[PDB]
Every structure is written in C-alpha cells, then in structure tokens.
Design a protein around this ligand. Structure first.
Ligand code: HL9
Ligand code: HL9
Ligand code: HL9
Ligand code: HL9
Lengths: 121, 123, 121, 123
C-alpha cells in the first residue's frame, strides 16, 4: 500500500485519491480539472502487488465512469501505466476515453492521451 | 444495462471475460487470456455507465486486469476502454492499453495498444 | 510494389489509393467517408521494402493532413500497421488523429482508432 | 509554419528529428533514434497543416519512419501524430504508434504506443 496510497495530481491539476489494497485492488476517487466533469467520481483498478525487484516500475490501471450524483457524460476513462518510486515518486500513464456512440459516430468515440501523476500541485 | 453486460464474453483471441455489472456502476469478475504470459483466471475490476443514453448510443465502460494470480506474475496490467452495444448480438467493442513494469532504459517500449471485440458466442 | 500498390477500402468505406515505391515510399490519395473531409487528400508514408520471410506482415505507415483545395480541418491522421498477403490480403492499422489545439484543449486533441483495409467495398 | 517547423529537433530520449516543411504541406527528412533496434539515420516522410488556425491553436502534423536503412532492418514502422507549437520555445508534442511485422500468433502484441515531445535544444 505504502507508495501508491495517497493523493496524486496530474499535469492538468486533476486530483487522484487512491488506496492500494493488499490484494492488488485500487479504490478511490478522481476529480478531473478538464472535460464534462464536476466533483468526485468513483474509480476502481488493479496493480501488481508483487512487482519485480530489478528497478522497474509497478504496473497498474484504473477506470472512471463519468457518472456521479451531479452529471453523466456517458463516457469512461481507463488509465494504464506504472508507479515509480524514488526521490520524485511518479505514476506515469497513458489513457483511453471512450464515449457512448452510435454506429455513424463510432470512429470518433475514443480519445487517447497521457497523464503524469506526482504528489505536488 | 445490467442484464445485458452481465455474462460470459469471448474476444477474437478466444479469451474469456466473465463480468457482473452491479447497480452502482461497478464491474467485477475474472479474465482468462488466450494470449501472452497468462494462464487461468485473473481478477478484474472496472466501471460502466449505469444510466446510458437512449438515443441509440452504446454504453461506455472500462476495466483493468493486473497480470498476477496464484500461478504467474507478468508484471503488467491491461486496461480495456470501450462500450457495450445491445441488439441481435450484444457486443463490447474495446481498445486496450497494456503497460509492463519498465526501467528508464525500457520505458519508451512499456505499452502495447490494441483492440478487442467481445461477443457471448463460444469460439 | 506488388501487393500494396492499388486501391483499398476500410470498414467505413473510405478509399485508400496508394503506390509503394521500390525505395520504401508510400504515395497516393485518401478519401474519408467520415469526419470533416471531402474529396481527395494527399498522403505520404513509408513501408519495409525488405520484410521478414517468416510469415509476418510488412510494417508500414502513412500520414494525411486534412487540408486540400476545398477544406482545412486543422488536423492530421497517421495510420500505423502492416500489410498481410494471402487469399484475403489486408492492411491492418491503428491510427491517431491529432487536431490543432490550445493549451486548455490539448488533453482532448487526439483520437485513436483502428482501420482494416481490404480490396473490396 | 515553414520556418518554424523546419529545423533539427530532439525528443526526451535524445533522438534527432531533422525535418523540412515544404510549401505543399509535406515533411521530409531523417530520423535517428536514441532507443531500440536502430542506428544512424532513417528516411521519414509526413504531412502538416500548411494553413493553420490563427486562434492560438497548434499546427497539426504527422510523419512515418520505417525502421530499415542500409545498416539495419527492424521490420517495424513508427508514425508520430501531433502538433507544432511556436513561441518562446517551439515544441512538437506527439503521440506515436510503432507497429512491428507480426504473425497471427503475435498480432495482438504488434503495436507499441507512446508520446514524444520535441524541442530544438541539444541534449
Ligand atoms: O469530458 C468527459 C469526461 C471527463 C474526461 C476528463 C479526461 S480523463 C483523461 C484526462 N485526464 C484528466 O485528468 N482529465 C481528462 N467526457 C466527454 C469527452 C468528449 N466526448 C466525446 C464524444 C464523442 N467522441 C469522443 C469524445 C463526450 C464525453
Ligand atoms: O503477456 C502479458 C500478459 C497477458 C496479456 C494478454 C493481452 S491483454 C490485451 C490482449 N487481449 C487479450 O485477451 N489478451 C491480450 N504481459 C506482458 C509481459 C511483458 N510484455 C512487455 C511489453 C512491452 N514492453 C515490455 C514488456 C509483453 C506482455
Ligand atoms: O474530421 C476530421 C478529419 C477527417 C478524419 C477522418 C478519420 S481518419 C481515421 C478514420 N478513418 C477514416 O477513414 N476516416 C476517419 N478532423 C476533425 C476531427 C474532430 N476534431 C477534433 C478537435 C479537437 N480534438 C479532437 C478532435 C476536429 C478535426
Ligand atoms: O526497436 C525498433 C526500432 C526503433 C524504434 C524507436 C522508437 S520510435 C518511438 C520512440 N521514439 C523514439 O525516438 N524512439 C522510439 N523496432 C521494434 C522491433 C521489434 N519490436 C516489437 C514490438 C512489439 N511487437 C513485436 C516486436 C520492438 C521495437
């Protein structure tokens, strides 16, 4: 739980509050500073609870469906990446945002990007 | 769509995706990959839009598997991002990101991307 | 030049007319059945002119900037994939569409998708 | 932006991206990768928006490298998709797709995805 558990911020100022359970579980809340989002959204994910000891990062991923008590933007984002420990701990991710879409709009249903999370900002 | 998404799905690789869609918007179940450094079942967790649009749009969803179970650890995780489409054959169309634990020397090559489409029909 | 050179169609009905030069060059035109596009757009790309002989595909990629005489949608798409020969020849790709964007919109500037090209439809 | 995009660029890996932006919207030059199964320079070709927006938007562009030259063939190709931003430090922000020649058994693992950001300052 040690390294991952806590509050993280990405380059957009979004706020990633996560708890890494002993079984490999990620649970918490996400607050996006961008897009059709307000307040907190439930997140869930998984991480490698027994990572390699050769200096490589700890692989992980999590999902947010963009529905909460206030808004439903009919979309979901998954972050795929890894936690790296050290003087400047970091969660480096790439992400996919899929929106509900008709057949005619399916080609344009998915964003890709990359978020870097640190414990500052 | 609880009753629609809940069930056993298969992708074009023959992988098996056993999922339950709770009322809260949660996805829980197991994933068995027919490809790569995997064997037997792995825990998955995810989220879905529990109140989708009624205009004919699909139902957005995602889920994550960390490739560690009691038999194997491939020090990697895959996230699938996509949507459920109901109808004559319900389908789940995804794109996915597989990130492997990497060093600074290897980090540029840490992530695969691909696309899986799931149906309920056994291969 | 043999296998790749010709007219190809993807699952959206877009039309991919390409010539594969002996030096590894891809040149031709693209006509998209989707998005802010009309008529033909210039494409250029590269392919492995000496691929492996173990049965694997021939890696390739090409770019379209979405500006022609009629329209400019301030965006560019790159397809990355490979040509596979056989009874049903195929060009299997994934693609990235980046749109010109401000700092506030950068997070949402890029689509990802996948196109499969065959010599029918 | 012809004079802006034309020049020698470096990404966060130390790779060298020598490009000329023609008036037609074309990109031509050479790429030297600091990472992976590459050595010396490879041909690149691409396209860019020769008439970008004046609202503060970046200039969209893309280019392709096939990883074969006179010294090496890694049976793969990378496409970079991104945009040029001018200013105090001009920057080219990209995401990229590297596809390797694959078999049916290997096809699910054929494609890396990543992101490179280029400046003109030597590492
Ligand atoms: O804006 C949101 C939800 C908030 C997303 C926030 C994103 S998550 C990755 C990035 N990192 C963050 O921290 N924040 C941003 N959803 C819209 C997106 C645009 N939409 C479409 C529609 C059709 N096709 C494609 C896209 C409609 C739904
Ligand atoms: O093979 C697995 C675990 C099984 C994943 C199965 C994949 S999930 C998406 C697709 N859909 C499925 O149903 N099945 C496949 N994991 C890594 C280990 C090390 N790997 C890398 C890659 C890049 N850099 C470094 C190391 C390669 C793959
Ligand atoms: O529609 C086009 C150009 C035509 C693209 C056609 C695409 S190429 C991949 C797919 N395969 C095809 O055969 N056809 C489609 N460009 C728009 C896209 C939406 N735009 C934004 C703006 C801001 N952020 C993200 C996206 C504005 C520019
Ligand atoms: O290493 C290279 C050629 C050099 C590419 C350099 C890359 S371009 C994006 C990034 N930005 C840079 O500046 N440099 C790097 N090519 C393949 C060969 C076989 N590979 C696979 C992968 C997946 N499946 C099967 C085989 C791994 C990589």
């Amino acid at each position: 739980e040690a390294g991952i558990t806590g509050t993280w911020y990405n380059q957009l100022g979004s706020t990633f509050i996560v708890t890494a359970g002993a079984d490999g579980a990620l649970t918490g809340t996400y607050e996006s500073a961008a897009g059709k989002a307000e307040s907190r959204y439930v997140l869930t994910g998984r991480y490698d609870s027994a990572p390699a000891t050769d200096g490589s990062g700890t692989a992980l991923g999590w999902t947010v469906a963009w529905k909460n008590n206030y808004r439903n933007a009919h979309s979901a984002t998954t972050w795929s990446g890894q936690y790296v420990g050290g003087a400047e701990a970091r969660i480096n991710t790439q992400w996919l945002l899929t929106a509900g879409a008709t057949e005619a709009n399916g080609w344009a249903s998915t964003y890709v990007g990359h978020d870097t999370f640190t414990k500052v900002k």
